[model samples]
Target: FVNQHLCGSHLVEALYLVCGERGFFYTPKT
Candidate 1:
């Protein structure tokens, strides 16, 4: 589910829509 990107009505997709692809959608390790 989370592995998916750039499509669907999932939360991640919404994040990309609201915050954008680089938004707080998914944080990576520093």
Candidate 2:
């Protein structure tokens, strides 16, 4: 899962960029 792969704050920030570029969306509405 993406949450597992995120690893750390840096990765979350990194993926935010990639997702922004790739039009990938994520919402953690627990």
Candidate 3:
């Protein structure tokens, strides 16, 4: 999806097609 949109360094309305108002993910537990 958006992974192909940001072809050279970017952010939201994707934030990498996800969320993170404070660094990719406020709590990225995976």
Candidate 4:
């Protein structure tokens, strides 16, 4: 399921693992 911070899929698990909550750093609006 999609959470408030994640896309709710394994496709982004690695990225979330590597960056954690601060992963938003890569976001253009961040």
Which model scores highest in lDDT? Answer: 2
For all predicted structures, in order, the TM-scores are 0.37, 0.39, 0.21, 0.33
In angstroms, give how far residue 22 of model 2 lies from its true place.
Answer: 5.5
Model 2 deviation from native, Cα RMSD in Å: 4.9
Q: List the residue pairs that clash in candidate 3.
A: 12-15, 14-17
* lDDT (0 to 1) per candidate: 0.58, 0.62, 0.47, 0.56
Taking all chains together, the TM-score of candidate 4 against the true structure is 0.33
* Model 2 stretches with alpha carbons more than 4 Å out: 1-7, 21-30
Superposed Cα RMSD, model 4: 8.3
* Tens-place lDDT digits, model 4, residues 1-30: 345555445546757776787753344354
Among all candidates shown, the one with the greatest TM-score? 2
- Whichever of 2 and 3 has more TM-score, that candidate is 2
Tell me the TM-score of model 1.
0.37
Q: Count the backbone clashes (under 3 Å) in each candidate.
A: 0, 0, 2, 0
The local lDDT score (0 to 100) that residue 20 gets in candidate 2 is 77
lDDT of 2 by residue, 1-30 (tens): 255456456666866877776764445552
For lDDT, candidate 1 versus 3, the one ahead is: 1
